């Protein structure tokens, strides 16, 4: 890999610089290089990895949606034939997106997840695994769609089971995991009732634990709780 000659600490330093410069592709490459050093990641380092790839894939998802919408409109009755270009370019963006997802899943499998023993790291990585299978699911068409959905579900479920056993209901990782699993249910799995139930229970159990928290932890937890509430408003 191109980052094989750079020190781990230098890669982390440059990832932080790239974040400041809003150079997320570079940030992702630097964090990939850091992971490939083979050492476990700290909490801050895990978060850098997450931010970098979320921003990269986020760009791709937004683009793919634009192109997919144009494509669907071309396939309506009364629409003028414009040749293969829309499909071709949507396919190009889609392939790049799938490549980014595969890269992240590869890092998790080789070997972040297997070395992660603490609840905070293991849940973080398993949530990521769910997330990147969910992003694959967004663009998947057919039966391979089914296996991708099941892979996302399985990762989220394993993460949920650990988080419920090992973390307080207000833990931001636990909250973010439940939020994203609820989005999976609603947006991917055609299970809006499961989504609503999960969001409601997550919100209520966190509410009841807020009293245990410092002012700063309270702010961190309530930020994510508000997103659960925003979704419940959207969904009901």
């Amino acid at each position: 890999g191109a980052m094989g000659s750079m020190e781990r600490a230098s890669l982390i330093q440059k990832a932080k610089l790239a974040e400041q410069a809003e150079r997320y592709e570079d940030m992702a490459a630097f964090m990939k290089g850091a992971v490939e050093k083979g050492e476990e990641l700290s909490c801050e380092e895990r978060n850098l990895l997450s931010v970098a790839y979320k921003n990269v894939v986020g760009g791709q998802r937004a683009a793919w949606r634009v192109l997919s919408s144009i494509e669907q409109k071309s396939n309506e009755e009364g629409s003028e034939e414009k040749g293969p270009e829309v499909r071709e370019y949507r396919e190009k963006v889609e392939t790049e997106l799938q490549g980014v997802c595969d890269t992240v899943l590869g890092l998790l499998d080789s070997h972040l997840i297997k070395e992660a023993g603490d609840a905070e790291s293991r849940v973080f990585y398993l949530k990521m695994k769910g997330d990147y299978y969910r992003y694959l699911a967004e663009v998947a068409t057919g039966d391979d769609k089914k296996r991708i959905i099941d892979s996302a579900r399985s990762a989220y479920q394993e993460a949920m089971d650990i988080s419920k056993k090992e973390m307080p209901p207000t833990n931001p990782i636990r909250l973010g995991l439940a939020l994203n699993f609820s989005v999976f249910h609603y947006e991917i799995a055609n299970s809006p009732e499961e989504a609503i139930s999960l969001a409601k229970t997550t919100f209520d159990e966190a509410m009841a634990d807020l009293h245990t928290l410092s002012e700063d932890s309270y702010k961190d937890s309530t930020l994510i709780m508000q997103l659960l509430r925003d979704n419940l408003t959207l969904w009901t």
């Binding site: 997450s50 997330d131 931001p172 939020l179 994203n180 609603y186 961190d220 959207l234 969904w235």
Partner: peptide, 10 residues
């Protein structure tokens, strides 16, 4: 309007 997932935050 799509559902909101977890943003970039610690």
């Amino acid at each position: 309007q799509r559902s909101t997932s977890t943003p970039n935050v610690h």
